[PDB]
Sequence to fold (152 residues):
Amino acid sequence: LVEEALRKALEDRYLLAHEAYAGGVAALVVVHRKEVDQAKAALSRAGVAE
Amino acid sequence: GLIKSLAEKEKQLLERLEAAKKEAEERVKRAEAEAKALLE
Amino acid sequence: SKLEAILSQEVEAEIQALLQEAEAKAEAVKREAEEKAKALLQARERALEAQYRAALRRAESA
Fold:
């Protein structure tokens, strides 16, 4: 779901990473600094939290 | 999540920028030297 | 990544801009010198010649 939010904003200009710890994966989006609002906004649409 | 890639490139570039500044100032310092001599 | 590609080209253009900037500042330095040195030499030659013409005057006057 987040990946879709991110996909729309970021396209492919992010490389999207997750690492498991069970119960979910601790996640990073790395984006350009320039891309940052669009990335945060993707989380915002989603309601996923930092 | 290509990580490595992006986490190498940012270093490589950076020290090249540093270096640029040095060679850069040197040119001014060259004309400064010449400025010093030409008056002296 | 495409992501780092943009970072590369960006940084690199700054590298190119620093050097270019520097060159112009070097010229500016250069151009000070030229005028200054010239500007020093004339006025003091000038002055001596007047102190010359005036010196003989007093001699002649004697």
Remarks:
- Chain B touches chain A at residues 1-3, 5-6 (CB under 8 Å).
- The radius of gyration of chain B is 18 Å.
- DSSP finds two helices and no strands in chain B.
- The helical segments of chain B are 6-12, 14-39.
